[PDB]
Amino acid sequence: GPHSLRYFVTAVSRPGLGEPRYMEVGYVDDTEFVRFDSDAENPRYEPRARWMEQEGPEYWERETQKAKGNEQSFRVDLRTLLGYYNQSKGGSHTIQVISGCEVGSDGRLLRGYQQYAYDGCDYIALNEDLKTWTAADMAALITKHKWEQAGEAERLRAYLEGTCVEWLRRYLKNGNATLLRTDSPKAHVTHHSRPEDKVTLRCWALGFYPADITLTWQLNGEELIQDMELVETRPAGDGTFQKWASVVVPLGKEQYYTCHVYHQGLPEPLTLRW
Amino acid sequence: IQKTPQIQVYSRHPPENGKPNILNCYVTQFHPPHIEIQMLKNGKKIPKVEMSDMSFSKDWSFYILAHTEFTPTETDTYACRVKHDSMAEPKTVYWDRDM
Amino acid sequence: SAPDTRPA
Ligand SMILES: *[C@@H]1O[C@H](CO[C@@H]2O[C@@H](C)[C@@H](O)[C@@H](O)[C@@H]2O)[C@@H](O[C@@H]2O[C@H](CO)[C@@H](O)[C@H](O)[C@H]2NC(C)=O)[C@H](O)[C@H]1NC(C)=O
Ligand SMILES: *[C@@H]1O[C@H](CO)[C@@H](O)[C@H](O)[C@H]1NC(C)=O
Numbered sequence: 098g099p100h101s102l103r104y105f106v107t108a109v110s111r112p113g114l115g116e117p118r119y120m121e122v123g124y125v126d127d128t129e130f131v132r133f134d135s136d137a138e139n140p141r142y143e144p145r146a147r148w149m150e151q152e153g154p155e156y157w158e159r160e161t162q163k164a165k166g167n168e169q170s171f172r173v174d175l176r177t178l179l180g181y182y183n184q185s186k187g188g189s190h191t192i193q194v195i196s197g198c199e200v201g202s203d204g205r206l207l208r209g210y211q212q213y214a215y216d217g218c219d220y221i222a223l224n225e226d227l228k229t230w231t232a233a234d235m236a237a238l239i240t241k242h243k244w245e246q247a248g249e250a251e252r253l254r255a256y257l258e259g260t261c262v263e264w265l266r267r268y269l270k271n272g273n274a275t276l277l278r279t280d281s282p283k284a285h286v287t288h289h290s291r292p293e294d295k296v297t298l299r300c301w302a303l304g305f306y307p308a309d310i311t312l313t314w315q316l317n318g319e320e321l322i323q324d325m326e327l328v329e330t331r332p333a334g335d336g337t338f339q340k341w342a343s344v345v346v347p348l349g350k351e352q353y354y355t356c357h358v359y360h361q362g363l364p365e366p367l368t369l370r371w
Numbered sequence: 372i373q374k375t376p377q378i379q380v381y382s383r384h385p386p387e388n389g390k391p392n393i394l395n396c397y398v399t400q401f402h403p404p405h406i407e408i409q410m411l412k413n414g415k416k417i418p419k420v421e422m423s424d425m426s427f428s429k430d431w432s433f434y435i436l437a438h439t440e441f442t443p444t445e446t447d448t449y450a451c452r453v454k455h456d457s458m459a460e461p462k463t464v465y466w467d468r469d470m
Numbered sequence: 471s472a473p474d475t476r477p478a
Contacts, residue, residue, distance in 0.1 A: 104472045105426050109404050121472055122425050129424055145423070160471065167475045174478045191404055193431055196473050211473070217372035217402040217431045221478070240478040249476065256473045264471045285385070287470065299470065303384070332424045333383040334393040334438035341470075 098361075099207055100126055100276070102265035103197035108171035112187045117175055119168040125268045125276055127308040128336060133164040140165070148272035178215055181236035191216055198261035204269075209257030213237075227254040280306040280337055281362030286371045291345065298371055299343040300356035304333070311359040312342040374432050375457040376401035378464040380450070386443045386468045394466065396437040396451035400428070407454035408437045411463075413447055443468070 103124045110117040119135040121142075130146035142160035144150060174192055184190070191214075198209040212222035219233040221240050228250055232238040244250065269276055282305035289297040302312055308330050314321045327342040346354055351371045358367040376398045383393035396410055410417045417439050424436040437451065449466040 106472075106475070107404060107427075120425070123472060124426070163472065163474060167472070170475050170477055177478055189403065189405070191402075193427060194475065195427070213478070214431045217374075219431075243478070247476075253473065260471060261473070289469075328379060329399070331379065331381075331397045332395070332436050333381075334395050334421075334423075334436065335383055337383070339381065339383075 099199055099201050100265060100269055101197055101199040102261055102268065103195060106167070106171075106194040106196070108168070108175060108192045110175045110190050112189065117172055119164075119171055121164055121167070125265065125272065127306075127332075127338070128272075128276060130268065130272070131160070133161070135168055146272060146275065148268075148275055151271045178236065181239055182215075192220075193217075196261075198257050198265060200262055200265055204262075204266050206258055206262050209254070209261060211253060211257070223250065223253060227257060275336070278306060279362040280304055282310060282358055282360050282367070284356065284358050284367050284369055286356055286369050288351065288371050290348075294348040295345050296348050296351060297343055297345055298351060298354055298356075299341050300358070300369060301339070301341045302358050302360070303339045304337045305339070305360055305362060306337050307361060308338045309361070310338070310340060311357075312340055313357045314342060314344040315355045315357060316346075316353060372402055373457045374400055374402045376406065376453055376455050376462075378451055378453055378462060380464050380466045381470070382441075382443070382466070382468075388443055388445050391440065391442050394439055394441045394449055396464070397424075397434070398437070398451075398453055399434040400432040401455055401457065402432050403456060404433050405456065406433075406435075407461075408435070409452045410437055410439055411450045411452060412441070414450075417441075 105122045107120045108117050121133040123131040128146055130149055132145050133142045142157055142164055171192055175190060193214040196211040199207045201207050209227055213220040221230050221232050221237040224231055230241045232241045282302040284302050287299045291297055300312055302310055314325055321344055325342050325344050330338050330340045333339050356369045377400050379397045381395050398408055410420050420437050420439045422437055426434050450463050452461050452463045454461045
């Protein structure tokens with residue numbers, strides 16, 4: 098199926114405490130595989146997935162130097178945005194960037210993207226065309242004009258269609274045993290009493306990969322999505338994910354509800370009852 | 372913009388006393404990024420805690436996972452304590468083995 | 471490999 102390469106970058110200033118903290122975290126699909134943290138003793142790009150041991154010393158040195166260069170660029174941006182927004186030098190501010198590309202099963206580009214945020218709000222983003230930018234406010238409009246005059250879109254497009262895609266294919270090839278695997282969900286239902294002759298039925302899906310999954314509760318053959326409570330799919334600490342979805346039902350009528358689990362690792366969806 | 376972190380505590384495998392497991396504290400939907408996350412065993416901070424899976428959603432709120440290997444006991448209690456600017460006081464969420 | 475970012 099399709100796969101993605103994403104980098105989550107965060108720069109946070111801290112007036113009075115020295116230089117801003119700078120972090121870069123990379124993911125291939127839903128798996129963290131590399132990380133850079135300026136607050137580490139000796140900041141360096143580091144592998145976060147076992148298969149990255151396949152990259153030689155040059156890779157780590159190159160990514161580390163690039164990260165330090167990016168860190169310096171963001172230090173400048175934090176200062177620049179204080180000016181654009183006419184803010185004080187004593188407050189903490191955050192810049193966030195998500196950059197990435199997605200390819201189909203054949204390794205060809207599906208889409209690329211790069212979006213910026215300042216203090217948790219949209220700042221500027223590359224449009225789907227990979228040619229123009231969309232600015233959220235007048236400060237971002239200044240940036241948009243600067244980048245157009247410098248031809249930044251063309252440079253970024255080259256990265257997205259070329260560098261990003263090519264590295265993603267390489268990571269998928271080297272880490273195939275991990276990234277192309279399928280771990281089937283194991284499910285179970287828990288029961289909890291409530292006041293007013295009602296019960297909470299919670300359906301759990303554990304140890305699966307990839308992260309995409311669908312959990313629904315049914316009654317009489319119809320789904321109860323609007324009556325369900327749930328948590329966003331979440332990492333379980335070992336590279337797998339988990340999720341739960343619950344519904345409140347009448348005491349004594351539990352046997353009438355069924356949990357359905359759909360996943361890449363389930364040739365036939367699972368159907369469970371309490 | 373200030374979003375209060377959602378704190379979720381859970382194990383990798385259904386808890387079975389004496390059997391190795393992984394305890395997770397997923398802290399999500401928060402902003403600003405500065406945060407303090409501590410995992411506790413019987414009220415005492417756990418030392419080996421690994422931080423991973425830092426990302427942010429479409430609305431830019433932050434997500435991060437704290438996890439540690441552990442072997443559950445019938446009497447041991449576990450919790451996750453979080454300090455963040457959106458909250459006046461630290462917040463502790465206990466592991467509910469029967470959830 | 472992450473992209474190189476430049477000043478806004
Ligand atoms: C994963 O792929 C390997 C092939 O190796 C990949 O390509 C290399 C150039 C290098 O980049 C590796 O890190 C990559 O993992 C598969 O191993 C081969 O399997 C075939 C049979 O299917 C066998 O004849 C070859 O001798 C194997 N070669 C190796 C690398 O030992 C491996 O099976 C794949 N894993 C799964 C199950 O997805
Ligand atoms: C910036 O804010 C200060 C007050 O904090 C104000 O005096 C000044 O006019 C502002 N700058 C502009 C050009 O809006």
